[PDB]
Enzyme design. Structure first.
Site, PDB file in Angstrom:
ATOM      1  N   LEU A  10      -5.977  12.804  11.523  1.00 45.13           N
ATOM      2  CA  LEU A  10      -6.968  12.037  12.263  1.00 45.13           C
ATOM      3  C   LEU A  10      -7.897  11.199  11.391  1.00 45.13           C
ATOM      4  O   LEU A  10      -9.091  11.085  11.674  1.00 45.13           O
ATOM      5  CB  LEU A  10      -7.778  12.957  13.182  1.00 45.13           C
ATOM      6  CG  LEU A  10      -6.927  13.704  14.215  1.00 45.13           C
ATOM      7  CD1 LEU A  10      -7.802  14.579  15.123  1.00 45.13           C
ATOM      8  CD2 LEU A  10      -6.078  12.744  15.046  1.00 45.13           C
ATOM      9  N   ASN A  32      -5.245  18.012  13.523  1.00 41.45           N
ATOM     10  CA  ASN A  32      -5.676  17.715  12.166  1.00 41.45           C
ATOM     11  C   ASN A  32      -5.808  19.033  11.431  1.00 41.45           C
ATOM     12  O   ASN A  32      -6.194  20.036  12.032  1.00 41.45           O
ATOM     13  CB  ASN A  32      -7.022  16.982  12.182  1.00 41.45           C
ATOM     14  CG  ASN A  32      -7.371  16.368  10.837  1.00 41.45           C
ATOM     15  OD1 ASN A  32      -6.741  15.396  10.396  1.00 41.45           O
ATOM     16  ND2 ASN A  32      -8.376  16.923  10.177  1.00 41.45           N
ATOM     17  N   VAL A  74      -0.404  11.611   7.517  1.00 42.59           N
ATOM     18  CA  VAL A  74      -1.192  12.306   6.504  1.00 42.59           C
ATOM     19  C   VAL A  74      -0.899  11.692   5.145  1.00 42.59           C
ATOM     20  O   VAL A  74      -0.071  10.782   5.033  1.00 42.59           O
ATOM     21  CB  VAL A  74      -0.892  13.817   6.494  1.00 42.59           C
ATOM     22  CG1 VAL A  74      -1.282  14.439   7.839  1.00 42.59           C
ATOM     23  CG2 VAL A  74       0.583  14.083   6.164  1.00 42.59           C
ATOM     24  N   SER A 128       2.822  -1.300   9.569  1.00 39.64           N
ATOM     25  CA  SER A 128       2.087  -2.417   8.989  1.00 39.64           C
ATOM     26  C   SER A 128       1.093  -2.963  10.012  1.00 39.64           C
ATOM     27  O   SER A 128       1.344  -2.922  11.210  1.00 39.64           O
ATOM     28  CB  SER A 128       3.063  -3.503   8.530  1.00 39.64           C
ATOM     29  OG  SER A 128       2.397  -4.574   7.889  1.00 39.64           O
ATOM     30  N   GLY A 130      -2.576  -2.528   9.294  1.00 34.90           N
ATOM     31  CA  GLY A 130      -3.867  -1.928   9.008  1.00 34.90           C
ATOM     32  C   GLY A 130      -4.457  -1.238  10.224  1.00 34.90           C
ATOM     33  O   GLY A 130      -3.746  -0.921  11.171  1.00 34.90           O
ATOM     34  N   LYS A 183       9.716  -1.144   4.273  1.00 40.79           N
ATOM     35  CA  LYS A 183       8.275  -1.325   4.093  1.00 40.79           C
ATOM     36  C   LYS A 183       7.954  -1.661   2.640  1.00 40.79           C
ATOM     37  O   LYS A 183       7.124  -2.517   2.363  1.00 40.79           O
ATOM     38  CB  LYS A 183       7.498  -0.085   4.565  1.00 40.79           C
ATOM     39  CG  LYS A 183       6.000  -0.158   4.329  1.00 40.79           C
ATOM     40  CD  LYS A 183       5.355  -1.129   5.304  1.00 40.79           C
ATOM     41  CE  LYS A 183       3.884  -1.383   4.965  1.00 40.79           C
ATOM     42  NZ  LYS A 183       3.079  -0.132   4.954  1.00 40.79           N
ATOM     43  N   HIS A 186       8.841  -5.286   1.982  1.00 44.93           N
ATOM     44  CA  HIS A 186       7.798  -6.068   2.645  1.00 44.93           C
ATOM     45  C   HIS A 186       6.561  -6.206   1.757  1.00 44.93           C
ATOM     46  O   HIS A 186       5.969  -7.296   1.668  1.00 44.93           O
ATOM     47  CB  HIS A 186       7.488  -5.391   4.001  1.00 44.93           C
ATOM     48  CG  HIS A 186       6.070  -5.514   4.487  1.00 44.93           C
ATOM     49  ND1 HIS A 186       5.034  -4.787   3.943  1.00 44.93           N
ATOM     50  CD2 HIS A 186       5.545  -6.203   5.527  1.00 44.93           C
ATOM     51  CE1 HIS A 186       3.917  -5.056   4.606  1.00 44.93           C
ATOM     52  NE2 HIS A 186       4.202  -5.904   5.576  1.00 44.93           N
ATOM     53  N   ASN A 187       6.178  -5.116   1.098  1.00 48.32           N
ATOM     54  CA  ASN A 187       5.017  -5.160   0.220  1.00 48.32           C
ATOM     55  C   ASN A 187       5.223  -6.134  -0.938  1.00 48.32           C
ATOM     56  O   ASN A 187       4.315  -6.873  -1.314  1.00 48.32           O
ATOM     57  CB  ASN A 187       4.685  -3.766  -0.318  1.00 48.32           C
ATOM     58  CG  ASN A 187       4.218  -2.803   0.770  1.00 48.32           C
ATOM     59  OD1 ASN A 187       3.813  -3.213   1.857  1.00 48.32           O
ATOM     60  ND2 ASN A 187       4.270  -1.518   0.469  1.00 48.32           N
ATOM     61  N   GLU A 190       5.136  -9.801   0.279  1.00 47.06           N
ATOM     62  CA  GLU A 190       3.754 -10.246   0.435  1.00 47.06           C
ATOM     63  C   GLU A 190       3.189 -10.802  -0.873  1.00 47.06           C
ATOM     64  O   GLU A 190       2.523 -11.849  -0.883  1.00 47.06           O
ATOM     65  CB  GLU A 190       2.908  -9.072   0.914  1.00 47.06           C
ATOM     66  CG  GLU A 190       1.460  -9.420   1.201  1.00 47.06           C
ATOM     67  CD  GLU A 190       0.700  -8.210   1.683  1.00 47.06           C
ATOM     68  OE1 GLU A 190       0.914  -7.809   2.837  1.00 47.06           O
ATOM     69  OE2 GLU A 190      -0.072  -7.629   0.894  1.00 47.06           O
ATOM     70  N   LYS A 260      -1.971  -2.695 -11.292  1.00 48.77           N
ATOM     71  CA  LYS A 260      -1.387  -1.427 -10.856  1.00 48.77           C
ATOM     72  C   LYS A 260      -0.924  -1.455  -9.405  1.00 48.77           C
ATOM     73  O   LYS A 260      -0.580  -0.420  -8.835  1.00 48.77           O
ATOM     74  CB  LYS A 260      -2.388  -0.279 -11.048  1.00 48.77           C
ATOM     75  CG  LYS A 260      -2.948  -0.145 -12.461  1.00 48.77           C
ATOM     76  CD  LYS A 260      -3.954   0.998 -12.534  1.00 48.77           C
ATOM     77  CE  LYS A 260      -4.599   1.099 -13.908  1.00 48.77           C
ATOM     78  NZ  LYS A 260      -5.652   2.155 -13.949  1.00 48.77           N
ATOM     79  N   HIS A 450      32.633  -4.927 -27.878  1.00 48.00           N
ATOM     80  CA  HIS A 450      32.413  -4.394 -26.536  1.00 48.00           C
ATOM     81  C   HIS A 450      33.386  -4.900 -25.471  1.00 48.00           C
ATOM     82  O   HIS A 450      33.430  -4.359 -24.368  1.00 48.00           O
ATOM     83  CB  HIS A 450      30.961  -4.632 -26.124  1.00 48.00           C
ATOM     84  CG  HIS A 450      29.985  -3.882 -26.972  1.00 48.00           C
ATOM     85  ND1 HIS A 450      29.933  -2.503 -26.998  1.00 48.00           N
ATOM     86  CD2 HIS A 450      29.047  -4.309 -27.851  1.00 48.00           C
ATOM     87  CE1 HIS A 450      28.996  -2.116 -27.844  1.00 48.00           C
ATOM     88  NE2 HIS A 450      28.442  -3.192 -28.374  1.00 48.00           N
TER      89      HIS A 450
END
EC number: 1.1.1.44
Length: 467
Positions: A10, A32, A74, A128, A130, A183, A186-187, A190, A260, A450
């Site tokens: 909550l 909660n 949570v 998404s 907020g 998600k 998506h971040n 942005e 960060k 190689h």
């Protein structure tokens, strides 16, 4: 059993999602870990609603209509696993746990598989929008165990943001951790969109010598055509905003965007899976570079740049617009390549068109452009690269002369355009049948034996005695 669904956690996000579900006629049981918060919520934010409370997990479970649906909102990590561990013994086969937190997709995949083996259906959903979005219309990106989808679709699509034609910004994403993977991408996307706008701004300001309000008007004008998007809308508003002293606010703001930030995980994922997601990478690194503010102050005293713009301003401004549009197309093409690779890595089936739709609605990156991406996948759900869709192919073709001029001019002027330039470099690489990477293969064969492959015989490895 009178509650349609429960939500645990909550904090504001959870409270708002609960109220949203309540608005849509669903009876929600709130819980909660600190149970006093339940009473507080019922007495305040949820006063007068159909929301009911529980004082223990066992009580919460008892109030739920089967198959039971429990949302976790949570703190990501151990708190999620700990609630799962406490819930499993209380549930019946076929009950459903939905983690709507900002969880790491590998954890979601693990939980999905482990719970499936125990007869519990697990969904990991991106969220998404907020707090405001949670309250009235979030974008939701559910993936995991698809057996759960028919049981949560009504509630999830009901509360989701809708686009103007009515479709919900929520559909089944795909298997296991796919929702949380989406998600994450998506971040990163942005970051790319924001950096691209910044480069356009820098060109307007430092090549075209435009005034703040003039640049606001340019972005407003741009928002009326193909680029129509929330980020451009707010950019225009920001640019004309005046401080209390009548001076523009933006020029007073410190130009350090952090080292960060979560966008890094998209670029790291790209490197892990070997996908050339170059624009998001440059956008992340550009934030890192901006954070070296003192270092840049020092460097500006020691390091010199090159220039004076002579041309038609309206025309070059239009070149910037088209450079921005083309670069954005490349960024999303790259993001969808990463989604495609994850599908391949994990054997996931991804709802590409639905993902584009889910990124409208509550998402900061919402745009008309995203609707065009959905259109591309609706036209051909087997589309392998966004750049091959006729709409996007045509757009890039129509923009490319402008794009090259914008970049060439910015380069001559000394304006940093890490995202415009990486997008153009990527386009020029992707479209070339032949690239000089054969020289890398020859070098490694020369110095380390190689081996390389001949064009005529792929998959057969040859060593040449170069010396």
């Amino acid at each position: 059993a009178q509650a349609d669904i429960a939500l645990i956690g909550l904090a504001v996000m959870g409270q708002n999602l609960i109220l949203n579900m309540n608005d849509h006629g669903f009876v929600v049981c709130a819980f909660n870990r600190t149970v006093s918060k339940v009473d507080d919520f019922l007495a305040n934010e949820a006063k007068g609603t159909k929301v009911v409370g529980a004082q223990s997990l066992k009580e919460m479970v008892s109030k739920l209509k089967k198959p039971r649906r429990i949302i976790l909102l949570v703190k990501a990590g151990q708190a999620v696993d700990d609630f799962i561990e406490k819930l499993v013994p209380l549930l019946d086969t076929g009950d459903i746990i939905i983690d709507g937190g900002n969880s790491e997709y590998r954890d979601t995949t693990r939980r999905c598989r482990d719970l499936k083996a125990k007869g519990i259906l697990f969904v990991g959903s991106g969220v998404s929008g907020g707090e405001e979005g949670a309250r009235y219309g979030p974008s939701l990106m559910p993936g995991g165990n698809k057996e759960a989808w028919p049981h949560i679709k009504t509630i999830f699509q009901g509360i989701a943001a809708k686009v103007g034609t009515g479709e919900p910004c929520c559909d089944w994403v795909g298997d296991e951790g796919a929702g949380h993977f989406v998600k994450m991408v998506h971040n990163g996307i942005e970051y790319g969109d924001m950096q691209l706008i910044c480069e356009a701004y820098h060109l307007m300001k430092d090549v075209l010598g435009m005034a703040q309000d003039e640049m606001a008007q340019a972005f407003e004008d741009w928002n009326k055509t193909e680029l129509d998007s929330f980020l451009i809308e707010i950019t225009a508003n920001i640019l004309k905003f005046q401080d209390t002293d009548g001076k523009h606010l933006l020029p007073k703001i410190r130009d350090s965007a952090g080292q960060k930030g979560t966008g890094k995980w998209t670029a790291i994922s790209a490197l892990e899976y070997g996908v050339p997601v170059t624009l998001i990478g440059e956008a992340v690194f550009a934030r890192c570079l901006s954070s070296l503010k003192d270092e840049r102050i020092q460097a500006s005293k020691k390091l010199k740049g090159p220039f004076q713009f002579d041309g038609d301003k309206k025309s070059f401004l239009e070149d910037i617009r088209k450079a921005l549009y083309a670069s954005k197309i490349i960024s999303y093409a790259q993001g969808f390549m990463l989604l495609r690779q994850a599908a391949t890595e994990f054997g996931w089936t991804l709802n590409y068109g639905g993902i584009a739709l889910m990124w409208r609605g509550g998402c900061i990156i919402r745009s008309v452009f995203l609707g065009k991406i959905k259109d591309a996948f609706d036209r051909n759900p087997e589309l392998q690269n966004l750049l091959l869709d006729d709409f996007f192919k045509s757009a890039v073709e129509n923009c490319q002369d402008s794009w090259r001029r914008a970049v060439s001019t910015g380069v001559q002027a000394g304006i940093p355009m890490p995202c415009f330039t990486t997008a153009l470099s990527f386009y020029d690489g992707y479209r070339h049948e032949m690239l000089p990477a054969s020289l890398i293969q020859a070098q490694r064969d020369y110095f380390g034996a190689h081996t390389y492959e001949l064009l005529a015989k792929p998959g057969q490895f040859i060593h040449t005695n170069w010396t």
